[PDB]
Amino acid sequence: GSTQGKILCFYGPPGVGKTSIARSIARALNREYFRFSVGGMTDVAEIKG
Amino acid sequence: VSGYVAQEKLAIAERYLVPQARALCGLDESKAKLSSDVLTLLIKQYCRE
Ligand SMILES: Nc1ncnc2c1ncn2[C@@H]1O[C@H](COP(=O)(O)OP(=O)(O)O)[C@@H](O)[C@H]1O
Numbered sequence: 001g002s003t004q005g006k007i008l009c010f011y012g013p014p015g016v017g018k019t020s021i022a023r024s025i026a027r028a029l030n031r032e033y034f035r036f037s038v039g040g041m042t043d044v045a046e047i048k049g
Numbered sequence: 050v051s052g053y054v055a056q057e058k059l060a061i062a063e064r065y066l067v068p069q070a071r072a073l074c075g076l077d078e079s080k081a082k083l084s085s086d087v088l089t090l091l092i093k094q095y096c097r098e
Pocket residue numbers: 014015016017018019020021
């Protein structure tokens with residue numbers, strides 16, 4: 001039936017197309033895209049505000 | 050509170066866990082049966098915690 005959530009991850013050497021498939025799926029499902037890097041972030045003001 | 054014995058997890062998960070997640074996906078038991086045998090294989094092998 002309805003849409004369902006699940007989280008997913010892709011991993012491998014950089015530049016394998018990970019983000020590229022992300023956006024490709026985003027235009028597949030028709031969902032909106034938005035990147036959000038969190039590598040090395042510490043402050044909580046950029047995540048919760 | 051303590052931990053849980055391998056068999057003990059079976060009697061938990063068949064009642065207090067499976068129906069809850071069934072309500073998370075919104076299904077009813079009529080279409081998504083999960084036998085005991087699947088549960089014992091799961092807990093015996095795939096999760097030792
Ligand atoms: N199968 C593929 N089809 C199209 N582009 C690919 C493929 N494999 C790798 N690429 C390319 O690899 C690059 C990596 O981009 P992307 O996945 O967007 O970020 P990341 O560098 O994190 O993997 C893109 O320029 C993309 O065109």
